[PDB]
Amino acid sequence: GSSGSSGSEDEWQCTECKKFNSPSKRYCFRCWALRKDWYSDCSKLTHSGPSSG
Numbered sequence: 001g002s003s004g005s006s007g008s009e010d011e012w013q014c015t016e017c018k019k020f021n022s023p024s025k026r027y028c029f030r031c032w033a034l035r036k037d038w039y040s041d042c043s044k045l046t047h048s049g050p051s052s053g
């Protein structure tokens with residue numbers, strides 16, 4: 001039938017209203033709610049430049 005209208009599907013889903021919104025944007029123009037972020041600090045990378053495995 002119809003898959004997207006001359007647009008991309010790289011929109012981020014909201015948590016409050018749960019509505020798709022442009023990625024570039026930060027705040028949700030739907031519920032004016034800014035997406036949250038979780039760090040979950042557990043350990044610290046003793047290394048700064050390179051990285052071991």
Ligand SMILES: [Zn+2]
Pocket residue numbers: 014015016017018019028029030031032033
């Ligand atoms: Zn929203």
